[PDB]
Structure formats: structure tokens, C-alpha cells
Amino acid sequence: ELRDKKQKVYSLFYRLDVVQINSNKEYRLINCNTSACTQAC
Amino acid sequence: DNVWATHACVPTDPNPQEIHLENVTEEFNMWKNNMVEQMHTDIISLWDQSLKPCVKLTPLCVTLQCTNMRGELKNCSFNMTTELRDKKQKVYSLFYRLDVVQINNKEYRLINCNTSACTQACPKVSFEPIPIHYCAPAGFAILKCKDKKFNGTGPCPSVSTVQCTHGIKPVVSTQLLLNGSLAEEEVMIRSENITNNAKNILVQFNTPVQINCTRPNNNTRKSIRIGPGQAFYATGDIIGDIRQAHCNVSKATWNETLGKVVKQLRKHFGNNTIIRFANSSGGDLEVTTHSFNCGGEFFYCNTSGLFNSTWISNSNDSITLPCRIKQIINMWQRIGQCMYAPPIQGVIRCVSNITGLILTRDGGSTNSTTETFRPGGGDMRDNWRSELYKYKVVKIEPLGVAPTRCKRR
Amino acid sequence: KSIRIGPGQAFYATGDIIGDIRQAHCNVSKATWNETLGKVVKQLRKHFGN
Amino acid sequence: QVQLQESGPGVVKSSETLSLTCTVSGGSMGGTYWSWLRLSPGKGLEWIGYIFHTGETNYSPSLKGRVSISVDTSEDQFSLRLRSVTAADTAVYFCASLPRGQLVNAYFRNWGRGSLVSVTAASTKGPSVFPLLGCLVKDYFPEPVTVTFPAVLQSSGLYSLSSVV
Amino acid sequence: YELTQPPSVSVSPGQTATITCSGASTNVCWYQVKPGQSPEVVIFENYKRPSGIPDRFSGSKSGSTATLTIRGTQAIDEADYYCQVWDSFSTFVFGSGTQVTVLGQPKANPTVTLFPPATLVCLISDFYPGAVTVAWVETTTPSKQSNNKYAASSYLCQVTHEGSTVEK
Ligand SMILES: *[C@@H]1O[C@H](CO)[C@@H](O[C@@H]2O[C@H](CO)[C@@H](O[C@@H]3O[C@H](CO)[C@@H](O)[C@H](O)[C@@H]3O)[C@H](O)[C@H]2NC(C)=O)[C@H](O)[C@H]1NC(C)=O
Ligand SMILES: *[C@@H]1O[C@H](CO)[C@@H](O[C@@H]2O[C@H](CO)[C@@H](O[C@@H]3O[C@H](CO)[C@@H](O)[C@H](O)[C@@H]3O)[C@H](O)[C@H]2NC(C)=O)[C@H](O)[C@H]1NC(C)=O
Ligand SMILES: *[C@@H]1O[C@H](CO)[C@@H](O[C@@H]2O[C@H](CO)[C@@H](O)[C@H](O)[C@H]2NC(C)=O)[C@H](O)[C@H]1NC(C)=O
Ligand SMILES: *[C@@H]1O[C@H](CO)[C@@H](O[C@@H]2O[C@H](CO)[C@@H](O)[C@H](O)[C@H]2NC(C)=O)[C@H](O)[C@H]1NC(C)=O
Ligand SMILES: *[C@@H]1O[C@H](CO)[C@@H](O[C@@H]2O[C@H](CO)[C@@H](O)[C@H](O)[C@H]2NC(C)=O)[C@H](O)[C@H]1NC(C)=O
Ligand SMILES: *[C@@H]1O[C@H](CO)[C@@H](O[C@@H]2O[C@H](CO)[C@@H](O)[C@H](O)[C@H]2NC(C)=O)[C@H](O)[C@H]1NC(C)=O
Ligand SMILES: *[C@@H]1O[C@H](CO)[C@@H](O[C@@H]2O[C@H](CO)[C@@H](O)[C@H](O)[C@H]2NC(C)=O)[C@H](O)[C@H]1NC(C)=O
Ligand SMILES: *[C@@H]1O[C@H](CO)[C@@H](O[C@@H]2O[C@H](CO)[C@@H](O)[C@H](O)[C@H]2NC(C)=O)[C@H](O)[C@H]1NC(C)=O
Ligand SMILES: *[C@@H]1O[C@H](CO)[C@@H](O[C@@H]2O[C@H](CO)[C@@H](O)[C@H](O)[C@H]2NC(C)=O)[C@H](O)[C@H]1NC(C)=O
Ligand SMILES: *[C@@H]1O[C@H](CO)[C@@H](O[C@@H]2O[C@H](CO)[C@@H](O)[C@H](O)[C@H]2NC(C)=O)[C@H](O)[C@H]1NC(C)=O
Ligand SMILES: *[C@@H]1O[C@H](CO)[C@@H](O[C@@H]2O[C@H](CO)[C@@H](O)[C@H](O)[C@H]2NC(C)=O)[C@H](O)[C@H]1NC(C)=O
Ligand SMILES: *[C@@H]1O[C@H](CO)[C@@H](O[C@@H]2O[C@H](CO)[C@@H](O)[C@H](O)[C@H]2NC(C)=O)[C@H](O)[C@H]1NC(C)=O
Ligand SMILES: *[C@@H]1O[C@H](CO)[C@@H](O[C@@H]2O[C@H](CO)[C@@H](O)[C@H](O)[C@H]2NC(C)=O)[C@H](O)[C@H]1NC(C)=O
Ligand SMILES: *[C@@H]1O[C@H](CO)[C@@H](O[C@@H]2O[C@H](CO)[C@@H](O)[C@H](O)[C@H]2NC(C)=O)[C@H](O)[C@H]1NC(C)=O
Ligand SMILES: *[C@@H]1O[C@H](CO)[C@@H](O)[C@H](O)[C@H]1NC(C)=O
Ligand SMILES: *[C@@H]1O[C@H](CO)[C@@H](O)[C@H](O)[C@H]1NC(C)=O
Ligand SMILES: *[C@@H]1O[C@H](CO)[C@@H](O)[C@H](O)[C@H]1NC(C)=O
Ligand SMILES: *[C@@H]1O[C@H](CO)[C@@H](O)[C@H](O)[C@H]1NC(C)=O
Ligand SMILES: *[C@@H]1O[C@H](CO)[C@@H](O)[C@H](O)[C@H]1NC(C)=O
Ligand SMILES: *[C@@H]1O[C@H](CO)[C@@H](O)[C@H](O)[C@H]1NC(C)=O
């Protein structure tokens, strides 16, 4: 909420929505090069 | 014939037409007309479309390092962006205590920064109310009542039609009706149900009471420029001393104005009741204090010396009301929409007519020898119901059948 | 879970799963499907060659 | 219709922060004072404070300085935080509603079921049995132990019971 | 600022009961609580009644005292009653609380038993009026037994009862 602070959070994403970019591995959301998603209420 | 659009509204005729309908008695009801419910929607619609080209103050929800009448003003320093997206600046401002909340000392944020980002009011559009006339479409009519003893409900025998209504100023206020129409003969008490104590009471005066204000702080406004073409008008240093805002009501008029109010209130509650007044019992700041807009700044005045009297049935002193100033304004009680008011340079003075009250009775007994009346407010539909009380919209049904001793060949 | 991504904006994320993780499946009855496919293939043989 | 539901921990250590959360279901968060109350067995019913949707709060002067109430209109939720709780701050905590307007004749509506908390110094101790005829348990923590008179909460925070035959 | 109520009111079934408050300057509203149940209003002004509340409850205010009368008390509404008055500084002021109980079974005398140890213990049992006082410390709130009676215990004796005293 305050734009000078950050938070480290975690979530559980499905495999079909997550693509690599290359202990753990770096990934990204699938539409990070096409558009931006609108979350349904 | 500003935030109140005079462009969209068509020009009216220079002279109106008013036909006096003789032998006509029509039943009115001020509490269930659909001319105030459309008006409230139009006030909201023409309010929130003038804040559409204005700047959105979303980069300003930051951590504010804040230091110190007394304790009202806080000196807050904070980071801020620049027109160039690579650089940053460190700025300061003077905020109020009613606008900031502690993060958990010397650690503050704005009060709205969990709910929404406020939209700063544009510094060129004005907040002055202008008269707007509500004209009827084709095939319809507006029937003004012209009785001088009308109490809102019931039959009016002096019905006259009109082209358009008179000039109704959208003045928003609480506990007092500033800049309104005056009664002609006597002080009028209007309520939906007198016996029920859950109904607000509208008191209309026949003479006005003048109120004058000061904001004695010589404020300086500086433009902290956020990005490309976007600015944030903060509060700079205050030149001279710092004194609280106040505004005054003359004692010799408010006394015997309350006398006329008590004399007209004893006609519904009995000839021997002791009429009392108390200051407030609300919980919100907009309900407890007399909230209005003087000169561009939103004042919340503590009207406790006005409503402090008892009345039992048998020359230059003034009452000073201290007021508080707030900048983050949630006006129409919509969840998630605020507005930041920029500061105004110099000294701001009211001059206004108190033309009514919104009272509320405390019940308790079926046979009471005393009555307590406290100021109300809250909903803004009772502000414009004191002006659209004589009007009524009707449709014309011009098709009739009648018996006559004649037949078609 | 709710993650505040700004003023009044929340992102609803999937948290922990209570219990075991199993596949989501789609049951379709077998005899009813065989009868319905028979009703389909009768009129398909009518329209396409007997 | 609007229903209110409390949620929070049941055991809070002394000199800590007690956090509760009331979630509403149905209705809207506007035009309502959301209030917090508690029902202590020693001092009766009490009022802690309310909060409006804008952010304006109102706390009780007895609990002023160590209380904080906040809202969340995006999730239809509000929460209470009490600081530096002692052993006398145990009660049943309710969340309620008040209509916006004059509070001279206003009464609390939309009560919750009540969440019971207890502030004790949790020193876990085994029971000590003394014969008397009957038996006595001197000090133990926590409730319960089977053996039947009910337990006694002492001033040191340890329970005690007795049995006769 | 204090609001004073009687600590207990005990009546027979079929008999009316009265609860008085004092020190009230504005309108008083009455709440009824139950053990393990949420509070509810029964008289939300000096005389008014909300929907769903039966007509056995009636209140009236005279001067600074507001009274609540229950007409024909039953085995139901054996409960604690509080009052509420709005005030300027503290927004809501509550009363001390009045316990209304009914006598659906006749009075029985308690049985005390003392045990030498250094802990001295007195056990009290089998008494229907639960208001008992112990003199010689920690004492219990008298809870209900399985046979619809009350028991209590003391730790470290004489006990005082309604018209009686037993010293051991
Ligand atoms: C309506 O008027 C009444 C008085 O006619 C106002 O009540 C007064 O409120 C002030 C501040 O809120 C109280 O002062 C405080 O009192 C105690 C003294 O023990 C102390 O905690 C503080 O130092 C402070 O001085 C004052 O006692 C109280 N007066 C009474 C008789 O209760 C009331 O605020 C007004 N209501 C409004 C403007 O809505
Ligand atoms: C009730 O009506 C009166 C009279 O119209 C209002 O007072 C007026 O307030 C406006 C606020 O914008 C003043 O305009 C400003 O005044 C000075 C001098 O020109 C300057 O700062 C600006 O250029 C601007 O014109 C106006 O002068 C003032 N009228 C008088 C006679 O002093 C009053 O505000 C109304 N009350 C409410 C609650 O709306
Ligand atoms: C956005 O990025 C995705 C992920 O890399 C691209 O999808 C792949 O595109 C390549 C192009 O050579 C294909 O070979 C793959 O089959 C695609 N899918 C996957 C799952 O790797 C996508 O084309 C990109 N979109 C753009 C550049 O517009
Ligand atoms: C508010 O605080 C700022 C600092 O954040 C004050 O500005 C300083 O004022 C002193 C005294 O006049 C000057 O010597 C400094 O040069 C100022 N610093 C900057 C960065 O401008 C400011 O005066 C305070 N305002 C008050 C107390 O009204
Ligand atoms: C404006 O930004 C500056 C630059 O980051 C802040 O100064 C630093 O603040 C951090 C906060 O964690 C301190 O640890 C540093 O010691 C500060 N100085 C430097 C040189 O890095 C400054 O606090 C910001 N102003 C605010 C928040 O009012
Ligand atoms: C406050 O009330 C006074 C008294 O009614 C108003 O002064 C009158 O204004 C009208 C405007 O049409 C004139 O026709 C009258 O001659 C005025 N009367 C007097 C005695 O001066 C005054 O305009 C009101 N002020 C506001 C801001 O509405
Ligand atoms: C407004 O005035 C009318 C007309 O006097 C009142 O209407 C009367 O209401 C009473 C209510 O019991 C009826 O019995 C009468 O028949 C009505 N008519 C007349 C001609 O008396 C109305 O109550 C008034 N409203 C107020 C004072 O709020
Ligand atoms: C105006 O309010 C009074 C007071 O509440 C109403 O009179 C009550 O009416 C109800 C039924 O609606 C009766 O049960 C009460 O006994 C009445 N109380 C009294 C003191 O007479 C009255 O009905 C309201 N007026 C209208 C037109 O609805
Ligand atoms: C409201 O009235 C008060 C007095 O009741 C006015 O305060 C006086 O203002 C003058 C002019 O600056 C000073 O010389 C006096 O010393 C002040 N009196 C006191 C007791 O402080 C005030 O200006 C009035 N406000 C208005 C007219 O807006
Ligand atoms: C508020 O402060 C400003 C700045 O000091 C004042 O503006 C001065 O006004 C005088 C008198 O008209 C002029 O001679 C000066 O040139 C102005 N500027 C400066 C920099 O001194 C302004 O008058 C003050 N406001 C009030 C109401 O006194
Ligand atoms: C509000 O302000 C007006 C002026 O704006 C005051 O009217 C002045 O009153 C004094 C004292 O009677 C007269 O000498 C002036 O001639 C009046 N001026 C004007 C322009 O009429 C009025 O008294 C103030 N009202 C208050 C303080 O209640
Ligand atoms: C509104 O004004 C009244 C009186 O004008 C204030 O009441 C005074 O409050 C102060 C606060 O320190 C007390 O010391 C006084 O004893 C009170 N006066 C009386 C006559 O009771 C009232 O607090 C103001 N309301 C606010 C600030 O919300
Ligand atoms: C996803 O990974 C996170 C860490 O990135 C896991 O969170 C940790 O879970 C362990 C379980 O033993 C806890 O001990 C840690 O305290 C947790 N850390 C944090 C920061 O919360 C999380 O459980 C994983 N989710 C799964 C496996 O569903
Ligand atoms: C899909 O689910 C429904 C509801 O659970 C199943 O319907 C039940 O069928 C059994 C026999 O297989 C009956 O005894 C139950 O009474 C039915 N339930 C109800 C609520 O009517 C249905 O069989 C399932 N479909 C499948 C497995 O293909
Ligand atoms: C400084 O600011 C604090 C903020 O809590 C305030 O209480 C105090 O009155 C101010 N002044 C002094 C001299 O400490
Ligand atoms: C509101 O902001 C405060 C101050 O930073 C913060 O403690 C609180 O958690 C916020 N509320 C929500 C619901 O995020
Ligand atoms: C109340 O007093 C006025 C005073 O003029 C009088 O006209 C009226 O008749 C009185 N009403 C009653 C019911 O006595
Ligand atoms: C009315 O005002 C006076 C003077 O401001 C004050 O002393 C008095 O207490 C007030 N009356 C009441 C009933 O509070
Ligand atoms: C997870 O695994 C353990 C060990 O297999 C099992 O006993 C336990 O029940 C599982 N947890 C849940 C929540 O099902
Ligand atoms: C298709 O074959 C079936 C075999 O039973 C026969 O009854 C039917 O007449 C045939 N239809 C045509 C159009 O030849």
C-alpha cells in the first residue's frame, strides 16, 4: 500500500499458467509479453 | 442564465410565465416527490464528472516523517518522484491532524491509503453554488403552490403552474440551512410525522441570521510537481502567528430567533411544555459538527453555544464557534472515493444567511412535560427538500369522452 | 489469501491445501452413453448410408 | 440480513497483544458504526469502541491508549487490537452494529456469537494429589484433569479441585 | 458517573418482577444476556418494544429512575439484565447488572464438610438459593449440579445462608 515498501509473499500456481525464463528455478506468468490480466471479482 | 456545469444546461427564457390556475385545489406531499431523488442523482453526476480531468494522487501514499491551535498542524517530510523517471526529490508539507494516521511516533501515513487514492480538486474550477432551474419536458407541467401557510403535506388551494422552478442553489450544509429561501409570514415547522421522534424536523425562518468567518492563518501554497504535467499543491510556511478558525453568530438575533422557533413549536406539543436545546449526540464528524464550505475550505464548526437553552412558558455581543479544517473529503458517503482539497492563499471570510434548521426530537414519554431538540443532518436530501416543497410534476392526459345530444351524419 | 498490491487493490492467491492433493475428474455414466451413441448412430446411418 | 462472526485466538499470554477480527456477511459497510464490546463476569457488560467506514474511530476513555480498531472495506471486515493485556482483561468479546446518526436513543444491533479469550501466565505444572474422606489436587495447569467439584482459579494462575466420597 | 442496580431479584413463577435503575439523565435501554448466548434488546427506549419481543416486558421512566417490569415470569427469562445510557464523554454507560431468578423448587439447606490438611478446604453442596457467602482466600462461583442444585468450595469456616448460618 505504501509505495516505498515491499513484501515477500508466496502462492500456488498451476503449471499451465507458468513458463520458464532461465536450488530453485526462475519462472514468470504466461502472459507477461502479450497483455495484462484483469482479476474477476 | 466551475464544478456546476452551465454549459450542458440550456439557456432559459429571460422572463418566465406563471399562469394562476383559478378554482384549483391540488394535494401536495413534500416527503414523497421524485424531484429531490432526481436532483440528488444529478448533483452526484455533475459533481463526479468535474473531477475526471483532475490529477489522481496515487504516488503520494508514502511514509511521512512528521514532526510537530496546538497539535492540529503537523510538518511532514517525505520522498517524491520527479518529471524525470530516474530521479527523486525530498519534499515537505503542512498537514492537519484530521488527515494523517500513525503507522506504529514520527511515522505517519494519510488516512485514505488503505481504501483509495484521493483525486485532487482542480485549482481553477470553483466550488461556488450557482442557481439551476429544473424545467419540465413537453407534455408535462410543474404546479407551484402559492399558499403562505402550507406545511408540506395536504391540499393546497392556490395552485399555479410554472414553466421552470426558481433558482435553487446546491448548498451543502449540516445543522443549518445556509443561503436558502425565506418564509413569508411565520417560522414554519415541517415534519413527516410530529408524534414520531425518528423523523427530522425542518425549521424555516422568516428573517435571516448573518454569519461571518475567519481563517486567520496567512497560508502559502507551493506546487510540488510530481511528474509530466502533474502537480500537488501543498501547504508552505504560515506567515505570522497560527490561530484557529472561527465563525460568529450574533447573540441578539439568535435569541428571539429561538423564541420564534419555540413559539411555533408549542403549537404541536402543548402550551405548557418546557422546550430545551442540546448541542449534539452524533458520532461522525459530519453529523456532530456544522459542516460547510467557506471560500473553498471545508469547515466543521462546533455549534455548542448556539443550541444551549431552556424555555419555560410564563447589544453587540456575539457567540464564537470554533471550527476545524479538513482536506481529505468524502462528500456523498460513497465507499472508496475521496477528494483532496488544495490550500487557498490568504484569509477566507464567510458571509451567509442561516435560513433554517434540521432538528431531531428526543422522545421517551407519551405524556412529557419537557422536550429536548438536538441538531441533525447526515443525508443531504433534506437540504434540497426545503426548496422543492411547493413544486409537483404532473402529466397531461388530453383525451375525454362526454355525453352530448348530437350524432354524426 | 489476500495480498494488498496497492490502495484498495487485493490479489487473491491460492494458499496451502488442507489434506491430500488429488486430480479433478469428470464422471459420465457408461450404459446411458452407449444407448445415446446407439441413438446417434441410427440416424447417422439414416443420413449417411444404411 | 447482515450477520457478524468473530475469529481470534483463545489463549493470549500476559503483556502481549490481543487481536480479534469480526467479519460481516450481507449488507454494506456504509452508514454504520462498527462497535466492539466485552462481557466480563466481574464488571458486567462494557463498551470498547466503534469505527466509521471513513476511518474515524471512537474509543472508550478507560481503554484509551492501548486499543486500536481498523476496517477493511474491500473484504467487508474489521479488527480489534488491545495492547499490554493483563489477567483482568478476560471476557467474552462481541462485535456489533450501530446506525449512523444520533446516538442518544441508539442501541447495539447485529450481535455476534462471542469469542471467549483468557489471559493467563501459562506455567505448565503437573497435578499434586493429597489425601484428606476425600482427595485434593493442589496445583495443575491446564484444564481439565479427571478423577467431582469444579476447578478453582487461584491468584497465581494455577487450577485446583477436590473430590469427596 | 455510576448507574446503580439491585444485585438480584428473586420471584416465584406467575409473579411479576421489577428492576430499577438510577442516575440516568437521558433515555435508558435494557439488554438481556444469557449464559452462552448473545445479548439482545428487550426495551430499546423508556417504553418502546422491538419486534419479536413478547408483551411481558414493560418499562417506564420517572425523573431519573427507569423501571422495567416483567409480567408473569416463567422458567424462561431467568437471566441477567443491564441498562444503557448515552453520555457526552463516555459514549455509552452500562449498569452493574441485575440477576432475575425463579424458584421452581423449594429451599434446601446446604451441607458443609471441612477437612484438616497446609491447605484448609470446605465443601458446600445441595442448596437451591445460590447466593452464599463464606467467612473464615479463594471461593467459587456456585455452579449447577446434576440434580438441579448448587455446590461450591473454598480454599485457605462459617457459611451464611438466607436465614441460617453453619460454622465448622
Ligand atoms: C456538548 O456539551 C457538553 C457539555 O455541555 C460536552 O461535554 C464535555 O466534553 C468535554 C470534552 O469532550 C469533556 O471534557 C473532558 O472531561 C474530563 C474531566 O474529567 C477529562 O477527561 C478531560 O480533560 C476533558 O476536560 C467534558 O467533561 C464534557 N462535559 C460534560 C458535562 O460531560 C460535549 O462534548 C458536547 N458535545 C458535542 C460538542 O458533541
Ligand atoms: C452564501 O452566499 C454568499 C454570497 O454569495 C457567499 O459568500 C461568497 O463566497 C465566495 C466564495 O467563493 C466569495 O467569492 C470569492 O471572494 C473573494 C473576493 O472576490 C476572492 O477570494 C474570490 O475571487 C471569490 O470571488 C464571495 O466574495 C462571497 N461573497 C461575499 C459578499 O463576500 C457564501 O460563501 C455562501 N455560503 C455558502 C455556504 O455557500
Ligand atoms: C510470449 O512468450 C511465450 C513464452 O515464451 C511465447 O510462446 C512460445 O513461443 C515460441 C516462439 O518460438 C514457440 O516456439 C513456443 O511453442 C511458444 N510456447 C511455449 C509454451 O513456449 C510467445 O510466443 C510469446 N509471445 C509473443 C512474443 O508475442
Ligand atoms: C518544516 O520542516 C522543514 C524541514 O523538513 C523546515 O524547513 C527548514 O527550516 C529551517 C528553519 O527555517 C531552515 O533553516 C531549513 O533550511 C529548512 N529546510 C528545508 C529543507 O527547507 C520548515 O521550516 C518546517 N516548517 C515549519 C516549522 O513551519
Ligand atoms: C527520502 O529518501 C531518502 C533516500 O533513501 C531517505 O533517506 C534514507 O532513509 C533510510 C530509510 O531506511 C535510512 O536508512 C537512511 O539512513 C537514509 N539516508 C540515506 C543517505 O540513505 C529518507 O528517509 C526519505 N525521506 C523520508 C522517508 O521522509
Ligand atoms: C440575506 O438576507 C437578506 C435579507 O433578506 C438579503 O438581502 C435581500 O436581498 C434581496 C435579493 O433579491 C433584495 O431584493 C433585498 O432588498 C435584500 N434585503 C435587504 C434588507 O437588504 C440578502 O441577499 C441575503 N444574503 C444572501 C447571501 O443570500
Ligand atoms: C399539515 O397540515 C395538514 C392540514 O391541516 C394536516 O393534515 C391533517 O392531519 C390529521 C392527522 O391526524 C388529520 O386527522 C386531518 O384530517 C388532516 N387535515 C386537516 C385539514 O386537519 C397535517 O397533519 C399537517 N402536518 C404536519 C403538522 O406535520
Ligand atoms: C406517527 O407516529 C405515531 C407515533 O409512533 C404513530 O402512532 C402509533 O401508531 C402505531 C401503529 O402504526 C400504534 O401501534 C401506536 O400505538 C401509535 N402510537 C401512538 C402514541 O399513538 C402514528 O401512526 C404515525 N402516523 C402515521 C400516519 O403513520
Ligand atoms: C468574532 O467575534 C470575536 C469577538 O467576540 C472577534 O475577535 C476579536 O477580533 C478583533 C479584530 O481582530 C480583535 O481586536 C479582538 O481582540 C478579538 N476579540 C477577542 C476576545 O479575541 C472575531 O474577530 C470575530 N470574528 C469574525 C467577525 O469573523
Ligand atoms: C500574507 O502575507 C503576504 C506576504 O508577506 C502579504 O503580502 C504583502 O502584502 C503587502 C500589503 O498589501 C504588500 O505591500 C507586500 O508587497 C506583500 N508581499 C510581501 C512579500 O510582503 C499579505 O498581505 C498577507 N496577508 C494579509 C491578509 O495580511
Ligand atoms: C458580518 O459582517 C458585516 C460586514 O461584512 C457586518 O456588518 C457591519 O456591522 C457594523 C456594526 O454594526 C457596521 O458598522 C458596518 O457598517 C456593517 N457593514 C456592512 C457592510 O453592512 C456584520 O455586523 C457582521 N456580523 C456579525 C459579526 O455577526
Ligand atoms: C464544543 O464547544 C464546547 C463549549 O464551547 C466544548 O466544551 C468544553 O470542552 C472543554 C474541553 O477541554 C472543557 O474544558 C470545557 O469545560 C467544556 N465546556 C463546557 C461548558 O462544558 C466542547 O468540548 C466542544 N466540542 C468538541 C471539542 O468536540
Ligand atoms: C510454499 O513454500 C513456502 C516457502 O516459500 C512454504 O512456507 C513455509 O512452510 C514451512 C513448512 O514446514 C514452514 O515451516 C515455514 O514457516 C513457511 N514459511 C513461510 C515464510 O511462510 C509453504 O508451506 C509452501 N507451500 C506448500 C508446500 O504448499
Ligand atoms: C451424479 O451425481 C448425482 C447426485 O449425487 C447422482 O445421482 C444419484 O444416483 C444414485 C444412483 O447412482 C441415486 O441413488 C441417488 O439418489 C442420486 N442422487 C440424487 C440426489 O438424486 C448421479 O448418479 C451421478 N451421476 C453419475 C455417477 O454418472
Ligand atoms: C511534539 O509532538 C508531539 C506528538 O505526539 C506532541 O504530543 C507534542 O505536544 C509536541 N510538542 C512538544 C513540545 O513536545
Ligand atoms: C491500514 O493501514 C495501517 C497503517 O499502515 C495498517 O496497519 C493496517 O494494516 C491497514 N489495514 C489494512 C486492512 O490493510
Ligand atoms: C394555547 O395558547 C394559545 C395562546 O394564544 C391559545 O390561543 C390556544 O387556545 C391555547 N390552546 C389550548 C388548547 O388551550
Ligand atoms: C450553556 O453555556 C454556558 C456558557 O457557555 C455554559 O456554562 C453552560 O454549561 C451551558 N449549558 C449547559 C446546560 O451545558
Ligand atoms: C500428511 O502426511 C502425514 C504422513 O504421511 C499424514 O499422517 C498426514 O495426515 C498428512 N496430512 C494431512 C493434513 O492430511
Ligand atoms: C435400412 O436397412 C434396414 C435393415 O433393417 C431396413 O429395415 C430399412 O428399410 C433400410 N432402409 C433403406 C432406406 O434402405
3-state secondary structure C1-50: CEEEEECCEEEECCCCCCCCCCCCCCCCCHHHHHHHHHHHHHHHHHHHCC
Other Cβ atoms within 10 Å of D6 Cβ, number:
19
CB-based contact D83:D66 (threshold 8 Å): yes
In 3D space, the residue among B29, B118, B35, B97 whose CA is nearest the CA of residue B338 turns out to be B118
CB-based contact B202:B360 (threshold 8 Å): no
SS3 D53: coil
Q: Is B139 left (phi over 0), alpha (psi -120 to 50) or beta?
A: left
Burial B87-107 (b: 16+ CB within 10 A, else e): eeeebbbbbeebbbbeeeeee
Residues of A at the B interface (Cβ-Cβ below 8 Å)? 1-5
Cα B204 to averaged position of ligand 1 atoms, centre (Å): 31
Residue D81 grid coordinates: 487490537
In 3D space, the residue among D126, D123, D116 whose CA is nearest the CA of residue D156 turns out to be D123
* B153 pocket-lining for ligand 7 (C-beta < 6 Å): yes
* B285 pocket-lining for ligand 16 (C-beta < 6 Å): no
Structural gaps in chain E: residues followed by a C–N separation over 2.5 Å: 117, 136, 156
Pairing of strands D77-83, E150-155: unpaired
Radius of gyration, alpha carbons of chain D: 20
Radius of gyration, alpha carbons of chain C: 24
In 3D space, the residue among B123, B108, B148 whose CA is nearest the CA of residue B342 turns out to be B123
Cα B246 to averaged position of ligand 9 atoms, centre (Å): 9
Say whether D45 and E82 touch across the interface (CB within 8 A): yes
Question: Residue E65 and residue A25: Cα distance in Å, rounded?
Answer: 75
Say whether E84 and D105 touch across the interface (CB within 8 A): no
- What is the distance, to the nearest Å, from the Cα of residue B128 to the centroid of all Cα atoms in its chain? 12
Other Cβ atoms within 10 Å of B279 Cβ, number:
16
Say whether B62 and A1 touch across the interface (CB within 8 A): no
CB-based contact B19:B141 (threshold 8 Å): no
- Read off the DSSP letter of residue E112: E
> Which run of H or E residues covers position E83?
strand E79-86
Residue E52 grid coordinates: 419479536
Phi, psi (rounded to 5 degrees) for B67: -120, 175
Q: Which ligand is nearest to the CA of C17?
A: 13
Question: Residue A23 and residue B148: Cα distance in Å, rounded?
Answer: 87
* Nearest atom in ligand 6 to B210's CA: 1
Radius of gyration, alpha carbons of chain A: 13
SS3 B20: coil
Residue B221 grid coordinates: 501554497
Other Cβ atoms within 10 Å of B137 Cβ, number:
7
Query: Cis link prior to D142 (omega < 30° from 0)?
Result: yes
Question: Residue E150 and residue E130: Cα distance in Å, rounded?
Answer: 6
Indicate which technique resolved this structure.
cryo-EM
Q: How many residues comprise chain A?
A: 41
Residue D36 grid coordinates: 466492539
Other Cβ atoms within 10 Å of E52 Cβ, number:
7
In 3D space, the residue among B156, B303, B321, B173 whose CA is nearest the CA of residue B247 turns out to be B321
SS3 B134: coil
Pairing of strands D67-72, E28-34: unpaired
In B239-317, DSSP assigns E strands to: 245-250, 274-277, 290-294, 297-301, 309-311
Burial E5-25 (b: 16+ CB within 10 A, else e): beeebebeeeeebebebeebe
In 3D space, the residue among E144, E19, E15, E16 whose CA is nearest the CA of residue E80 turns out to be E19
Instruction: Give residue B132's identity as a one-letter amino acid code.
Output: I
In 3D space, the residue among E83, C22, C25 whose CA is nearest the CA of residue D47 turns out to be E83
Instruction: Select from D47, D105, D114 the Cβ nearest to the Cβ of E94.
Output: D47
Rounded to a whole number of angstroms, the distance from the CA of E52 to the nearest CA of chain D is 14
Does residue D94 belong to the interface with chain E, where contact is any CB pair within 8 Å? yes
- What is the distance, to the nearest Å, from the Cα of residue E8 to the centroid of all Cα atoms in its chain? 4
Task: Walk across the sheet containing D129-131 and list its strands.
Answer: D129-131, D134-140, D159-164, D152-153
Residue D150 grid coordinates: 469444579
- Read off the DSSP letter of residue B42: H
In 3D space, the residue among A9, A24, A1, A3 whose CA is nearest the CA of residue C13 turns out to be A9
Say whether C7 and B336 touch across the interface (CB within 8 A): no
Q: Which residue has the cell 491430500?
A: C20
Instruction: Give residue B22's identity as a one-letter amino acid code.
Output: E
Question: Residue B302 and residue B41: Cα distance in Å, rounded?
Answer: 30
Q: Which residue has the cell 461450591?
A: E152
Rounded to a whole number of angstroms, the distance from the CA of B293 to the nearest CA of chain D is 19
Radius of gyration, alpha carbons of chain B: 25
- Read off the DSSP letter of residue D43: T
Contacts of E87 (CB under 8 A, 6+ apart): E1, E25, E26, E93
Other Cβ atoms within 10 Å of B12 Cβ, number:
13
Does residue C15 belong to the interface with chain B, where contact is any CB pair within 8 Å? no
Residue B95 grid coordinates: 498537514
Cα B66 to averaged position of ligand 17 atoms, centre (Å): 63
CA B354 to each of CA B154, B173, B210, B380, E80: distance values in angstroms, whole numbers, following the listed order: 27, 11, 7, 17, 49
From chain B, pick out residues whose CB is under 8 angstroms from the CB of A1: 61, 113-114
Cα D89 to averaged position of ligand 4 atoms, centre (Å): 45
SS3 D36: strand
Radius of gyration, alpha carbons of chain E: 19
CA D8 to each of CA B217, D19, D115, E70: distance values in angstroms, whole numbers, following the listed order: 48, 7, 7, 37
CB-based contact B208:B238 (threshold 8 Å): no
Question: Nearest C-alpha to atom 2 of ligand 11 is from which residue?
Answer: B212
- Read off the DSSP letter of residue B36: H
In 3D space, the residue among D4, D29, D19 whose CA is nearest the CA of residue D108 turns out to be D4
Pairing of strands D159-164, E37-43: unpaired
Q: Searching chain D, which residue's CA lies closest to the CA of residue B100?
A: D55
From chain C, pick out residues whose CB is under 8 angstroms from the CB of D74: 8-10
In 3D space, the residue among B286, B312, B313, B316 whose CA is nearest the CA of residue B299 turns out to be B286
